[PDB]
Design a protein around this nucleic acid. Structure first.
Ligand SMILES: [Mg+2]
Ligand SMILES: [Mg+2]
Ligand SMILES: [Mg+2]
Ligand SMILES: [Mg+2]
Ligand SMILES: [Mg+2]
Ligand SMILES: [Mg+2]
Ligand SMILES: [Mg+2]
Ligand SMILES: [Mg+2]
Ligand SMILES: [Mg+2]
Ligand SMILES: [Mg+2]
Ligand SMILES: [Mg+2]
Ligand SMILES: [Mg+2]
Ligand SMILES: [Mg+2]
Ligand SMILES: [Mg+2]
Ligand SMILES: [Mg+2]
Ligand SMILES: [Mg+2]
Ligand SMILES: [Mg+2]
Ligand SMILES: [Mg+2]
Ligand SMILES: [Mg+2]
Ligand SMILES: [Mg+2]
Ligand SMILES: [Mg+2]
Ligand SMILES: [Mg+2]
Ligand SMILES: [Mg+2]
Ligand SMILES: [Mg+2]
Ligand SMILES: [Mg+2]
Ligand SMILES: [Mg+2]
Ligand SMILES: [Mg+2]
Ligand SMILES: [Mg+2]
Ligand SMILES: [Mg+2]
Ligand SMILES: [Mg+2]
Ligand SMILES: [Mg+2]
Ligand SMILES: [Mg+2]
Ligand SMILES: [Mg+2]
Ligand SMILES: [Mg+2]
Ligand SMILES: [Mg+2]
Ligand SMILES: [Mg+2]
Ligand SMILES: [Mg+2]
Ligand SMILES: [Mg+2]
Lengths: 137, 159, 204
RNA sequence: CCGAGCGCGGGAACAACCGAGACCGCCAGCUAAGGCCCCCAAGUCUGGGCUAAGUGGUAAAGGAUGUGGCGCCGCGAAGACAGCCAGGCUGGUCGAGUGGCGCCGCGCCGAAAAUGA
RNA sequence: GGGGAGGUUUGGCACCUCGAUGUCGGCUCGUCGCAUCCUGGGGCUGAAGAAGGUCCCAAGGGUUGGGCUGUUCGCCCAUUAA
RNA sequence: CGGAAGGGAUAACCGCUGAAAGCAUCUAAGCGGGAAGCCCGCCCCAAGAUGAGGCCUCCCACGGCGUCAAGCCGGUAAGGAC
């Protein structure tokens, strides 16, 4: 009968965003979020690392995105459309562009969201240093 | 490119002369050089876009040179009866058909002369900047096309 | 960014040069600044004026440790007036010269569960020809299968009034520094005896 | 073929399109179509190109010095095209390519709809 | 002569609904589209100016009251920025 | 009393400098102006923003079972409710 993990301490990580293609970056951050580089993987469980990102504001993005790419945010009401172009995003709270794109590669359940909570993002660095932080790439 | 002070750098080029000092943002993938008392700019290939980028720098530079050389200035005619212009301190006021005289404070790096109320010379180290403020002035009252009136440069009247 | 708390005392009109002026009178008792909020400690800047004189008895609270912590005879209420840091220990009508324009905040009288007719100046039915049981009704509220729902925000009847109402830009007329009065252009929310707060406008 | 295979895989979802005809069981293996950056299993695989439109993410007659690839015709180191000096093609000066047609690849415009994309 | 877009007209088809999906007009309440009537910005004009014309951009708000007809629509009266 | 002002970014459009393509061009690098519209600004809601924020202040150990561990029962504090 297949092995099954017991409780474990959560590994943390640190990433530098500068120069990273936003998506290509998200992908990994995602695959980390699910305990999915670990070989004792377990779906129903949430033993993902605790990815911490810094220098978000610097995220490279190809093509015309900045100008061209629009962020839809539907309020509840008549004409709650709300389109926000990629720049205005970074220009004001920019952590989002990254957040707003890991949430995206995370699966959908309560677990997915448990995970979105492990991920912690700042444009900085200067994240609350605490302990772990093993930088990556 | 002589008598000057060209000084390379990564993505930009410092161009110094009597007139002033100009930071002239060039392409990084181009190769600005410094042969003798002159300057070259050689191109990494023959791709459509390297050519575009090429000339554009080889001029963007020259301009910066002459920019601290003789420097730059433009000429503004102020035709039509009432129309005229008194210089005042730094900024130039100028009455031109409006019911309000237009006070135009001068951008840093710029300074303009009013040889005659009918003429206006705009002097500065910087082409682009000159050209702008120049038109920026013509703008206050573009040339009518039913009669000579308002600011011209020194080019045909539309007739 | 001046500001002082007060109470809509009442209104009458008074005569200027040679025309009548509708004025409401705010009494704006000497407001004891009671805390200040810095960009460092608080992250934003403003100032906590107190207002009514309180019984040191009913202040039995941990509230004592606030007034005490700033040596202020205990007040009844105290609101912040954002983005404005004074001096001395109290703000008074003196911030206001006659002719200055102010925005008075107040709390609209409370109409309870309000008719759509009263709440939205809706049309409602016909006193006559047609039906008789939709006289004051809102009538239609939607479409058909599409959307097949009502829009949020749809105007409907129900508890209306008794809410935070700011009426912008009234003119201060003669301010009576003596009896602590502040005269204005009348149009100021809530009933008499209500707390209100007056401030500098946005004209320019 | 569905009907009677609204049983299974793919195609987002979807009787009849693609794959395949489910006797029962398995915490074994090979495959099919379709896929192998994350949600989502398996290549952020190797090599050669093309495209800068988010094209791809799916609209026409027609239009355009988009872009790359190929073919032919015209003037050119006996000095051409481009401007600049003189005269009404001529001259010089400059000094190496220039003008037009045609066919292929990818693209551009033509392109306005009603609850939120 | 040619190519389209739209899905507001008149239709064609007969796919759900005949153990029921109430029809035109009005009222009340609207909300969306833009292919814009006004107001804002502009290009050309056979634009002197003023007024206009045609096209471009722009939904933010606005878009009157009556006569006649069940009318929608339309005509008409008096206005309007419309 | 209100529609603003104002700041910012843009639409059509107007331009500065400038190649590719000796000239020419608003553009391909770069830059300025430009809408009642976009984002701000004003007004109101708002931390169930479960991502539950911040400030100021007041009250404060264990009295008995569970062997580390989560708790359980009681009279209380500030304070709150009736
Ligand atoms: Mg009380
Ligand atoms: Mg009535
Ligand atoms: Mg009846
Ligand atoms: Mg009845
Ligand atoms: Mg629906
Ligand atoms: Mg069969
Ligand atoms: Mg995978
Ligand atoms: Mg690869
Ligand atoms: Mg590779
Ligand atoms: Mg290409
Ligand atoms: Mg043809
Ligand atoms: Mg075609
Ligand atoms: Mg072509
Ligand atoms: Mg052929
Ligand atoms: Mg009909
Ligand atoms: Mg049939
Ligand atoms: Mg039934
Ligand atoms: Mg029924
Ligand atoms: Mg029914
Ligand atoms: Mg019917
Ligand atoms: Mg016009
Ligand atoms: Mg006109
Ligand atoms: Mg006119
Ligand atoms: Mg348009
Ligand atoms: Mg339009
Ligand atoms: Mg709308
Ligand atoms: Mg409308
Ligand atoms: Mg509205
Ligand atoms: Mg009638
Ligand atoms: Mg008719
Ligand atoms: Mg040139
Ligand atoms: Mg030019
Ligand atoms: Mg939430
Ligand atoms: Mg004690
Ligand atoms: Mg004790
Ligand atoms: Mg007691
Ligand atoms: Mg007590
Ligand atoms: Mg009580």
């Amino acid at each position: 009968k297949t092995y099954v993990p017991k409780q474990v301490e959560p590994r943390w990580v640190l990433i530098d965003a500068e120069g990273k293609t936003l998506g290509r970056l998200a992908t990994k951050i995602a695959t980390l979020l699910r305990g999915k580089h670990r070989p004792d993987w377990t779906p129903n469980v949430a033993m993902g690392d605790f990815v911490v990102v810094v220098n978000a504001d610097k995220i490279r993005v190809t093509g015309k995105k900045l100008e061209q790419k629009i962020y839809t945010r539907y309020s509840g009401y008549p004409g709650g459309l709300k389109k926000i172009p990629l720049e205005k995003m970074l220009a004001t709270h920019p952590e989002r562009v990254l957040e707003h794109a890991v949430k995206g590669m995370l699966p959908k359940g309560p677990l997915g969201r448990r995970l979105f909570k492990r991920l912690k993002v700042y444009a900085g660095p200067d994240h609350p240093h605490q302990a772990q932080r093993p930088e990556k790439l | 490119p002589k008598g000057v002070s060209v000084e390379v750098a990564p993505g930009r080029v410092k161009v110094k002369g009597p007139k002033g000092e100009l930071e002239v943002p060039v392409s990084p993938e181009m190769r600005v050089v410094v042969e003798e008392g002159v300057v070259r700019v050689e191109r990494p290939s023959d791709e459509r876009r390297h050519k575009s980028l090429h000339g554009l720098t080889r001029t963007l530079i020259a301009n910066a040179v002459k920019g601290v050389s003789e420097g730059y200035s433009k000429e503004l005619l102020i035709k039509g009866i009432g129309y005229r212009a008194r210089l005042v301190g730094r900024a130039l006021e100028l009455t031109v058909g409006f019911s309000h005289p237009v006070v135009v404070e001068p951008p840093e790096g710029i300074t303009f002369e009013v040889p005659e109320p009918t003429r206006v010379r705009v002097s500065g180290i910087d082409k682009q900047k000159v050209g702008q403020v120049a038109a920026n002035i013509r703008a206050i009252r573009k040339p009518s096309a039913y009669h000579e009136k308002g600011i011209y440069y020194a080019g045909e009247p539309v007739r | 960014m001046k500001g002082i708390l007060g109470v809509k005392v009442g209104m009458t009109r008074i005569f200027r040069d040679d025309r009548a002026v509708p004025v409401t009178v705010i009494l704006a008792g000497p407001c004891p600044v009671v805390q200040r909020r810095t960009p460092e400690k608080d992250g934003y800047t403003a100032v906590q004026l107190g207002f009514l004189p309180q019984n040191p008895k009913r202040v039995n609270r941990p509230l004592k440790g606030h007034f005490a912590k700033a040596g202020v005879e205990p007040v009844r209420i105290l609101r912040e007036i954002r983005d404005f840091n004074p001096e001395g220990d109290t703000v008074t009508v003196e911030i206001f010269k006659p002719g200055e324009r102010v925005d008075v905040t107040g709390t609209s009288k409370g109409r309870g569960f309000a008719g759509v007719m009263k709440r939205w100046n809706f049309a409602g039915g016909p006193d006559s020809h047609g039906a008789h049981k939709i006289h004051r009704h809102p009538g239609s509220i939607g479409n058909r299968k599409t959307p097949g729902r009502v829009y949020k925000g749809k105007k409907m009847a129900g508890h209306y009034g008794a809410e935070r109402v700011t009426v912008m830009n009234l003119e201060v007329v003669d301010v009576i520094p003596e009896e602590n009065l502040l005269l204005v252009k009348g149009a100021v929310p809530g009933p008499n005896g209500g707390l209100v707060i007056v401030r500098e406008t946005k004209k320019a």
